[PDB]
């Protein structure tokens with residue numbers, strides 16, 4: 001697979017790891033829609049607004065199956081550790097106009 005999941009469950013914004021690479025979600029958008037990270041980095045999305053959001057990678061992008069992340073409520077977070085270089089597009093399942101990509105270098 002090309003990413004591992006530290007926590008299957010969302011967790012609190014206060015529990016995000018030190019020196020985490022954070023992408024905020026607010027105003028119905030991923031605030032950093034094109035993020036560039038290195039192989040081995042963990043990206044953490046944090047939902048800053050009341051409307052629930054997730055990240056969803058379709059089948060074949062991070063692995064054989066789709067990775068449909070859990071819905072994050074306000075001030076909840078979710079992390080993925082990327083293990084292989086490439087460009088990985090994602091969207092928000094209930095709000096597919098919200099699109100972003102992670103470029104792992």
Ligand SMILES: [Cu+2]
Pocket residue numbers: 052053054092093094095098
């Ligand atoms: Cu959303």
